[PDB]
Motif scaffolding. Sequence first.
Motif, PDB file in Angstrom:
ATOM      1  N   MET A 185     -31.816  13.245  60.495  1.00 14.62           N
ATOM      2  CA  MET A 185     -30.717  14.097  60.926  1.00 14.62           C
ATOM      3  C   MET A 185     -29.456  13.720  60.166  1.00 14.62           C
ATOM      4  SD  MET A 185     -31.403  14.227  65.008  1.00 14.62           S
ATOM      5  CE  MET A 185     -30.669  15.856  65.001  1.00 14.62           C
ATOM      6  N   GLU A 186     -28.593  14.701  59.937  1.00 13.42           N
ATOM      7  CA  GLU A 186     -27.433  14.520  59.081  1.00 13.42           C
ATOM      8  C   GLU A 186     -26.156  14.473  59.904  1.00 13.42           C
ATOM      9  OE1 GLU A 186     -25.442  17.246  55.795  1.00 13.42           O
ATOM     10  OE2 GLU A 186     -27.360  16.497  55.064  1.00 13.42           O
ATOM     11  N   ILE A 187     -25.211  13.651  59.451  1.00 14.85           N
ATOM     12  CA  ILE A 187     -23.910  13.531  60.095  1.00 14.85           C
ATOM     13  C   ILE A 187     -22.877  13.343  58.999  1.00 14.85           C
ATOM     14  CG2 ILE A 187     -24.069  11.047  60.384  1.00 14.85           C
ATOM     15  CD1 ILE A 187     -22.422  11.123  62.769  1.00 14.85           C
ATOM     16  N   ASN A 188     -21.633  13.702  59.297  1.00 16.17           N
ATOM     17  CA  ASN A 188     -20.507  13.448  58.412  1.00 16.17           C
ATOM     18  C   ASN A 188     -19.586  12.442  59.081  1.00 16.17           C
ATOM     19  OD1 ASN A 188     -18.768  13.542  56.293  1.00 16.17           O
ATOM     20  ND2 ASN A 188     -17.931  15.566  56.759  1.00 16.17           N
ATOM     21  N   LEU A 189     -19.245  11.374  58.359  1.00 16.16           N
ATOM     22  CA  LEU A 189     -18.603  10.210  58.959  1.00 16.16           C
ATOM     23  C   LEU A 189     -17.083  10.267  58.892  1.00 16.16           C
ATOM     24  CD1 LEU A 189     -21.079   7.449  57.891  1.00 16.16           C
ATOM     25  CD2 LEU A 189     -20.236   7.833  60.189  1.00 16.16           C
ATOM     26  N   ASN A 190     -16.520  10.340  57.686  1.00 15.10           N
ATOM     27  CA  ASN A 190     -15.074  10.221  57.545  1.00 15.10           C
ATOM     28  C   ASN A 190     -14.350  11.357  58.251  1.00 15.10           C
ATOM     29  OD1 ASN A 190     -16.465   9.230  54.785  1.00 15.10           O
ATOM     30  ND2 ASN A 190     -14.758   7.885  55.329  1.00 15.10           N
ATOM     31  N   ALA A 191     -14.925  12.558  58.213  1.00 11.78           N
ATOM     32  CA  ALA A 191     -14.310  13.688  58.897  1.00 11.78           C
ATOM     33  C   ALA A 191     -14.146  13.400  60.380  1.00 11.78           C
ATOM     34  CB  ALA A 191     -15.145  14.947  58.684  1.00 11.78           C
ATOM     35  N   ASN A 192     -15.167  12.810  61.003  1.00  9.18           N
ATOM     36  CA  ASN A 192     -15.091  12.528  62.432  1.00  9.18           C
ATOM     37  C   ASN A 192     -14.010  11.502  62.747  1.00  9.18           C
ATOM     38  OD1 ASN A 192     -17.957  13.875  62.698  1.00  9.18           O
ATOM     39  ND2 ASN A 192     -17.268  13.384  64.770  1.00  9.18           N
ATOM     40  N   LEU A 193     -13.928  10.433  61.956  1.00  8.84           N
ATOM     41  CA  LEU A 193     -12.910   9.417  62.203  1.00  8.84           C
ATOM     42  C   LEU A 193     -11.514  10.004  62.064  1.00  8.84           C
ATOM     43  CD1 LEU A 193     -15.130   7.463  62.442  1.00  8.84           C
ATOM     44  CD2 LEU A 193     -14.133   6.067  60.662  1.00  8.84           C
ATOM     45  N   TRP A 194     -11.290  10.769  60.995  1.00 11.08           N
ATOM     46  CA  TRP A 194      -9.985  11.384  60.800  1.00 11.08           C
ATOM     47  C   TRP A 194      -9.667  12.351  61.930  1.00 11.08           C
ATOM     48  CZ3 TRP A 194      -5.582  10.896  58.349  1.00 11.08           C
ATOM     49  CH2 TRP A 194      -4.733  11.997  58.257  1.00 11.08           C
ATOM     50  N   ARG A 195     -10.666  13.110  62.379  1.00 11.54           N
ATOM     51  CA  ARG A 195     -10.450  14.055  63.466  1.00 11.54           C
ATOM     52  C   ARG A 195     -10.061  13.340  64.749  1.00 11.54           C
ATOM     53  NH1 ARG A 195     -12.948  17.966  67.157  1.00 11.54           N
ATOM     54  NH2 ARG A 195     -12.128  20.008  66.504  1.00 11.54           N
ATOM     55  N   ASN A 247     -27.576   2.849  59.936  1.00  7.34           N
ATOM     56  CA  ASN A 247     -26.706   1.748  59.547  1.00  7.34           C
ATOM     57  C   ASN A 247     -25.330   2.294  59.192  1.00  7.34           C
ATOM     58  OD1 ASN A 247     -25.711  -0.717  58.826  1.00  7.34           O
ATOM     59  ND2 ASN A 247     -26.830  -0.852  56.891  1.00  7.34           N
ATOM     60  N   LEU A 248     -24.286   1.692  59.761  1.00  5.74           N
ATOM     61  CA  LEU A 248     -22.969   2.322  59.745  1.00  5.74           C
ATOM     62  C   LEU A 248     -22.086   1.849  58.594  1.00  5.74           C
ATOM     63  CD1 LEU A 248     -21.541   3.108  63.255  1.00  5.74           C
ATOM     64  CD2 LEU A 248     -21.344   4.392  61.143  1.00  5.74           C
ATOM     65  N   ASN A 249     -21.811   0.545  58.519  1.00  7.55           N
ATOM     66  CA  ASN A 249     -20.862   0.060  57.520  1.00  7.55           C
ATOM     67  C   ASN A 249     -21.365   0.288  56.102  1.00  7.55           C
ATOM     68  OD1 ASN A 249     -19.749  -0.802  59.891  1.00  7.55           O
ATOM     69  ND2 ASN A 249     -19.205  -2.838  59.134  1.00  7.55           N
ATOM     70  N   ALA A 250     -22.678   0.197  55.896  1.00 10.28           N
ATOM     71  CA  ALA A 250     -23.233   0.410  54.566  1.00 10.28           C
ATOM     72  C   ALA A 250     -22.885   1.795  54.047  1.00 10.28           C
ATOM     73  CB  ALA A 250     -24.745   0.210  54.590  1.00 10.28           C
ATOM     74  N   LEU A 255     -20.290   3.800  54.870  1.00 12.31           N
ATOM     75  CA  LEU A 255     -18.876   3.907  54.525  1.00 12.31           C
ATOM     76  C   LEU A 255     -18.585   3.217  53.200  1.00 12.31           C
ATOM     77  CD1 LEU A 255     -18.591   4.866  57.479  1.00 12.31           C
ATOM     78  CD2 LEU A 255     -16.473   3.590  57.570  1.00 12.31           C
ATOM     79  N   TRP A 256     -19.097   1.996  53.036  1.00  8.21           N
ATOM     80  CA  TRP A 256     -18.864   1.270  51.794  1.00  8.21           C
ATOM     81  C   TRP A 256     -19.468   2.009  50.610  1.00  8.21           C
ATOM     82  CZ3 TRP A 256     -16.183  -2.000  49.161  1.00  8.21           C
ATOM     83  CH2 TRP A 256     -16.720  -2.591  48.017  1.00  8.21           C
ATOM     84  N   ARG A 257     -20.671   2.555  50.782  1.00 10.68           N
ATOM     85  CA  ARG A 257     -21.322   3.267  49.694  1.00 10.68           C
ATOM     86  C   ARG A 257     -20.555   4.523  49.320  1.00 10.68           C
ATOM     87  NH1 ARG A 257     -25.967   6.911  49.074  1.00 10.68           N
ATOM     88  NH2 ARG A 257     -26.799   6.487  46.977  1.00 10.68           N
ATOM     89  N   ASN A 258     -20.047   5.250  50.314  1.00  8.84           N
ATOM     90  CA  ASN A 258     -19.267   6.449  50.029  1.00  8.84           C
ATOM     91  C   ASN A 258     -18.014   6.110  49.241  1.00  8.84           C
ATOM     92  OD1 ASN A 258     -20.219   8.987  50.612  1.00  8.84           O
ATOM     93  ND2 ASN A 258     -19.803   8.819  52.806  1.00  8.84           N
TER      94      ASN A 258
END
Lengths: 48, 48
Positions: A37-47, B40-43, B45-48
């Motif tokens: 399953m896919e998620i978008n990370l930075n968008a959620n944190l900024w939101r 896995n979460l931090n990996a 963000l760092w990779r992006n």
Amino acid sequence: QAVKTTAANGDQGNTTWQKDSTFAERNEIGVGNNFAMEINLNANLWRN
Amino acid sequence: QAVKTTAANGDQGNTTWQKDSTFAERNEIGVGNNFAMEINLNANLWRN
């Protein structure tokens, strides 16, 4: 389920036995990519 | 579906009534842990 090949004289690639003598009969195998399953990370944190 | 014990004279655990008088006959229940995907979460963000 496992399978083997026969004596293979000529055009015997069609002829294929069952190799239950070695392998089991209910092995587990997947085909193609794995479920995910896919998620978008930075968008959620900024939101937030 | 719910069940209830009997008078239990001796070795009467096999005897077991249905308590359908009170409980509904389609109660839902889960067994074991719950469904759970992993990421896995931090990996990421760092990779992006």
